[PDB]
Amino acid sequence: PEWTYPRLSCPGSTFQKALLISPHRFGETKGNSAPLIIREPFIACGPKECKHFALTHYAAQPGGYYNGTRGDRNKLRHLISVKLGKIPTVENSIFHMAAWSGSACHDGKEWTYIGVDGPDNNALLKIKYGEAYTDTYHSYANNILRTQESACNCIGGNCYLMITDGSASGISECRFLKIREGRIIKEIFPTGRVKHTEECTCGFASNKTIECACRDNSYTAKRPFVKLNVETDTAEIRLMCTETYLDTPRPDDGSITGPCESNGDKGSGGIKGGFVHQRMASKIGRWYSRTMSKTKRMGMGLYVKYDGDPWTDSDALALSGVMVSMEEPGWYSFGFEIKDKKCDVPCIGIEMVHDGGKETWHSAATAIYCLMGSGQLLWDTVTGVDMAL
Amino acid sequence: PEWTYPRLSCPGSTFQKALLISPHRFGETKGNSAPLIIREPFIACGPKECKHFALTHYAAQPGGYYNGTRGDRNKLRHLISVKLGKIPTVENSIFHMAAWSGSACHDGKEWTYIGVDGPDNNALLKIKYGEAYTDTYHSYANNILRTQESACNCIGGNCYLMITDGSASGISECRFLKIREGRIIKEIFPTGRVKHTEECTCGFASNKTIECACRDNSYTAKRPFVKLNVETDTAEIRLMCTETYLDTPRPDDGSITGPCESNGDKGSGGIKGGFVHQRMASKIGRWYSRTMSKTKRMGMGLYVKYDGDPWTDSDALALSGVMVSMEEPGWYSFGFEIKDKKCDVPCIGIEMVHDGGKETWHSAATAIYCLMGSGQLLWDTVTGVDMAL
Amino acid sequence: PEWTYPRLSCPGSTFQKALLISPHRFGETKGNSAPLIIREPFIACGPKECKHFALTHYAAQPGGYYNGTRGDRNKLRHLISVKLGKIPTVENSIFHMAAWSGSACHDGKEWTYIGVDGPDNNALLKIKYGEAYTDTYHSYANNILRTQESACNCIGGNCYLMITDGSASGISECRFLKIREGRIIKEIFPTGRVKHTEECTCGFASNKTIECACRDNSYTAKRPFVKLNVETDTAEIRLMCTETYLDTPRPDDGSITGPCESNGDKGSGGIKGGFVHQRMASKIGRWYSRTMSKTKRMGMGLYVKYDGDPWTDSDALALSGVMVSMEEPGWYSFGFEIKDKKCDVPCIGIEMVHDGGKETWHSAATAIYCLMGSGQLLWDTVTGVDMAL
Amino acid sequence: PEWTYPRLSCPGSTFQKALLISPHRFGETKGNSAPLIIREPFIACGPKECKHFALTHYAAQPGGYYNGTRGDRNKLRHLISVKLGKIPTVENSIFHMAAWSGSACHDGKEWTYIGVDGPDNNALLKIKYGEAYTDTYHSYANNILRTQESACNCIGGNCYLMITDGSASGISECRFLKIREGRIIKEIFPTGRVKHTEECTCGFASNKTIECACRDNSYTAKRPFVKLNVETDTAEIRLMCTETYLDTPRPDDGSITGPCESNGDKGSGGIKGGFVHQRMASKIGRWYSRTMSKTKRMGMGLYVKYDGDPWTDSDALALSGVMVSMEEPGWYSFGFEIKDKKCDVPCIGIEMVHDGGKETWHSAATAIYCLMGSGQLLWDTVTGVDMAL
């Protein structure tokens, strides 16, 4: 089989609600099912199949191991998948590797799986190519080495991946790894605005360029925006100039005074953001998602911009529709691409966390919206879970 | 692999009881299983395999989410399948897409999946070709856009599908979509008696003609009868003339006074009806199913007519046997075709709803009868479920 | 792929304990599993794979549907399988068809499935070739038409199957059906001792002859013994002459006075018996199983005879070992053949029924012994189920 | 497909934590899962896939059959597998054969499965090639005939396996079987220090030599060390000379006075030990695991030695890291090899037994560490199970 490359996108001018995976709809005390407790879900597709990934706390609902499940990192957390459309339960799932931070992607021939574990002060990125554990990468700032929580991107067999290391409250200067058949064949050190880049959501703008919309957990509600040239293996990063700030928390739209590079206020904390390309013959569409609340992880709106340059564009993104209403959880979001026979379908996935605090179970549904047809986005997504059951 | 075409039917002159799928036989409080709560099941087959589809309420029995499950449309309802012969449970099932109205069919190369969701006033038909979301179609009468709840039909790669839009109590003028590799390549606007057509059950009479037996939810207990010419992509609709009225409710057989086109009385409400062709070298068999009760969704009898013209034939259909006795639920029914090595097996499927009102769970078994051998239909089907358990 | 033929058996001179499938070891009230309630298990293999068949009461343990489960025939009973080695549970199982009497076999290219249902006075044998329902056969004595409860046997694409019809207490004159790609291409009417033949266990003695060891439910504890010539499609039946009477109940060995054809006493009732061939270059081995108790369904011993003629041989069979001790249930038993790369492995399977009467659940484990190596049979099989749990 | 041969190992200089399979994390009373009760897990891989084997007590947690589950041998114990990464539950598992001692391995074309059962005084090794039961081997010392509890090793189609027979407290003189397409084509009788060899962990040092690190259950805390020449099918055994005694219990490192062959003290009892080769172009790495406690089955450290000769090397092994801390169970350990596209990944697996005595359930998690990247081993493995739940 042949290496995959980004293709022209399938025809379409709007996203529509596609699929909800709400495994805790079957988690009642009165029920008989074992959905896995998870967070940081993402989706990645090869030629034939999409897989729904997540980071489990290796516990189920109903169950006795709720405690710790609101936590980020421990020695039990694993990267798991199911084929997309299956409920990720104890039995349907496969456990790929120990991980408290993840990524995966298909290169046309095989699956690369990425999982970070280790102690906070010296963590370790591991790479699996199919069945074989294949390579590692070491902590360079000795402070919670970390990856995308979304799909890596492969072209001509060469798979690119964002990592970062550093204080979540401070300086976290990201790197990219060029990976081929599961082995690291180079490190790319971005230039430009590089002081804090987290959890990049990356995809192909063309055969020459990968672009990522990332999270600054410390200094700004603007998303750092990566442009990675895969011909030269060089990357530059600058803040998104759009007045439609995509992070949460954030201040009012347009309120960050001054030129594109201005950090502004209300920039502490953050959330991973969805971002996907629509590649047309002579026009590029960029689709983004952000929370409906400016302050809390509630709701998710979808946004679009055709052409321009996200580094210098001060104008608003166009609100394309409400995916998750203000009354429903809107947590992490991510882009991915489904492979049709002759073209690529852009989609956004949304993690809808069931959050009842540290004294209950802590897990998530995943909602999916994809480019399809014409017109306007029509319907929002609810999880339907009562956390008391 | 090659596109499929309708073939000559396998030899046979009677249907026989084939298979019951009664997932709630494993739904007891005292039990350990998770059958999905569903309705509107149907079956569709490719060359190798049949799939058993249904519209889930995304809830299981036993479970805490019974409430709403008697309802028709909500934001949780999804199109699901299992391979035919598997119990559609939480874990065996795959979730294809968000849908409160569905259809699917195989074209010889791949599966097309159809699901309608959206608000009642502006609903949306979505199309999936394998993994890829592929096209949409918009509400044209802004009143619960709707589809077959049974298999679409593909020939030479071209897959045809009935939709309708309009008041369930009033005018609902249906359309057909010609779909190819998941994309709509034309709309067909039927002529003739077109004031209310719902939930058509369609199949091939030949390589030139698709025929459908549909439901009039407002004006008549006679079934509107579609004839769609796939060479010219044109369709005409007229009422079935048979005295053996196939809808429920209905008046006594023969009691609708006057010529073929007369609407008659007791025509308010309705039920989707099974219908399948037996294609022979020089004779066509049409098999239909209708409820044993004239008024309630109880029982299911099978009926046949060889040759003639359902638009002008006033004679009775021949009662071929009792599939479901008067004492057992007989809800929706549908036709489909199993692909043998060299010929096609016609079958009727019957949805047997467990109905205990809005304050209990609301789901369904599926019974299957197929053409096989000679003689007379021998045995009826019971679900065996006690809804108190 | 090519049609299968019986081959020379793999080397070996003894059977050994191979595999127990005891699905009710996971059926506790305190447990979380759903093993299917079943009886009449058998096993059949193609080139790649063996399937473990049984007739379910469409109920699980734990569950609310125990009542009726001791019964032989009803409208819920179905033929199911799993790949051999899997626990036949609600979810692992596939439901092939409605059946209260069954058989299956692979012809090298595809699976033929056989299931009888219908009313007692007019029952119906149904045939499925892969997915397609394909043929039927009608009741000829209008009294519980019935089949093998073990594998049919295919050669050169032609699959042979024993059926019978008649009073279980009286005259039940069996027939054979020659089936090809799921269609009956002839009926064979045996000659000879034909007054009562039930539940034949059949296999290949050579490319020319199929042989069966059957049950007489009325007149004798000797097993009727079929020899079917597949070149001429003719069959003759005579009683087994061996003093080692293989039925249960039975009188003491050797106590049936007079010549081979003598019926003797203690012949009322019966049990289906295991029987398998070991085909060697210039010697034929016949392996049989019978209960350790002469009167009750307790224990199972394995027996062998090389060469001779079972119709005229008065000598004892050689006791080869105890498969199930006197203290464990020994119910139906059956032969089958596993396909190695170049040769065929003969095996006997034993149904070990959990019998606590009509007021508890009624189901069965399956024990498997196969030809393997040299020496002497070493270990017996226990089910390990406490029916109180 | 072609026979497999040992290849050059994938690049790497350290092991890292890869994967935990902790099926009892889903075994709570309050939960809905059925993990199998097991012990003696091991892993074996073919070209495409790794399988996770174990010896079940044919019981689940939660369940009613805990009693006996601390025991070594009974008539219910079976060899089971799942694909590596799946939770071995009642439904995910396949049951290969009755066994209370096991082994498996892939030869490039098919799976060989090994299982010993029988009475203690006359036990029986059985061999399965795919589906077919294929050969047996008899007890030669009439005292619990036994095998590796880890993978056999195939080269050019020829698969080698260690067995032993004899008193666990006394003389147990092991043998090797050369097996080809499931049939024993020779016995190899080792020479040298042969008085007690148990549970050898074997792999390829090269195309010419298999090496094993075994357990002496009676006379020494030094591991007997096998070198098997596959060209000549001859084997010699001597004690490991290293001061880093790999058995448990053991005395202080270096305390066994005298030359390499000295037995020393604290040698009664034992544990099976992990051992895997790293084959380089002109250097051989040997990786071993031993318990952190000198006396109890607690913790697991990983060790390495490059080149030398384990029979004559008195020097210490290099401590490479702590896989399981002193506070966590460290029971059996084993080596295996994952097949990358062009090279072989060495790994160690560790059985982490949940031991609460004979009056609770007795089962095990499996931890996996593999060669991957550079540097130092970073993280230990905990099971996370509270046996009270």
Ligand SMILES: *[C@@H]1O[C@H](CO)[C@@H](O[C@@H]2O[C@H](CO)[C@@H](O)[C@H](O)[C@H]2NC(C)=O)[C@H](O)[C@H]1NC(C)=O
């Ligand atoms: C990027 O490059 C790929 C690979 O070169 C392009 O895919 C080719 O597209 C043409 C049809 O336009 C096919 O005939 C070739 O078979 C494809 N090659 C491969 C290796 O798949 C793709 O069109 C390019 N994508 C862009 C420009 O967006």
Ligand SMILES: *[C@@H]1O[C@H](CO)[C@@H](O[C@@H]2O[C@H](CO)[C@@H](O)[C@H](O)[C@H]2NC(C)=O)[C@H](O)[C@H]1NC(C)=O
């Ligand atoms: C409808 O058309 C199809 C396709 O042309 C017919 O199928 C052909 O049947 C002949 C044998 O009668 C085969 O040799 C061809 O291979 C078939 N073609 C294809 C593309 O499958 C089919 O017989 C027709 N069905 C009718 C008339 O009912």
Ligand SMILES: *[C@@H]1O[C@H](CO)[C@@H](O[C@@H]2O[C@H](CO)[C@@H](O)[C@H](O)[C@H]2NC(C)=O)[C@H](O)[C@H]1NC(C)=O
């Ligand atoms: C019965 O007939 C079959 C089919 O003719 C025999 O199988 C053949 O065996 C030879 C080797 O002895 C192979 O070269 C052929 O390929 C086989 N043919 C087929 C169609 O499989 C088989 O040996 C015979 N069995 C007996 C005599 O017991």
Ligand SMILES: *[C@@H]1O[C@H](CO)[C@@H](O[C@@H]2O[C@H](CO)[C@@H](O)[C@H](O)[C@H]2NC(C)=O)[C@H](O)[C@H]1NC(C)=O
């Ligand atoms: C052991 O022998 C095998 C088989 O001969 C060697 O595998 C060969 O390796 C070369 C490349 O180095 C390939 O071109 C061949 O296709 C391989 N042959 C087979 C049959 O796989 C292997 O390199 C040897 N392993 C060692 C020396 O460790």
Ligand SMILES: CCC(CC)[C@H](NC(C)=O)[C@@H]1[C@H](O)[C@@H](C(=O)O)C[C@H]1NC(=N)N
């Ligand atoms: C402290 C660094 C954070 C990234 C900005 C942190 N990442 C990790 C790997 O711990 C994320 C953050 O704390 C949590 C969130 O914001 O939802 C999830 C959390 N992500 C994961 N648990 N994998």
Ligand SMILES: CCC(CC)[C@H](NC(C)=O)[C@@H]1[C@H](O)[C@@H](C(=O)O)C[C@H]1NC(=N)N
């Ligand atoms: C109001 C329009 C009706 C069609 C005539 C209605 N269709 C939908 C899509 O809501 C059906 C009808 O109300 C119910 C029935 O008759 O059983 C099922 C119901 N079908 C579905 N829930 N999919």
Ligand SMILES: CCC(CC)[C@H](NC(C)=O)[C@@H]1[C@H](O)[C@@H](C(=O)O)C[C@H]1NC(=N)N
């Ligand atoms: C009354 C005729 C009997 C055959 C001799 C009878 N067969 C059927 C099809 O009902 C069997 C017999 O009654 C029971 C037994 O002997 O175990 C099983 C039973 N077999 C099945 N339930 N399939």
Ligand SMILES: CCC(CC)[C@H](NC(C)=O)[C@@H]1[C@H](O)[C@@H](C(=O)O)C[C@H]1NC(=N)N
């Ligand atoms: C008495 C001989 C022992 C080998 C040294 C013994 N082997 C068997 C087959 O019974 C092992 C030992 O008793 C137990 C242990 O040490 O953990 C496991 C146990 N292994 C198994 N139950 N398969």
Ligand SMILES: [Ca+2]
């Ligand atoms: Ca921020």
Ligand SMILES: [Ca+2]
């Ligand atoms: Ca009507």
Ligand SMILES: [Ca+2]
């Ligand atoms: Ca008898």
Ligand SMILES: [Ca+2]
């Ligand atoms: Ca020792």
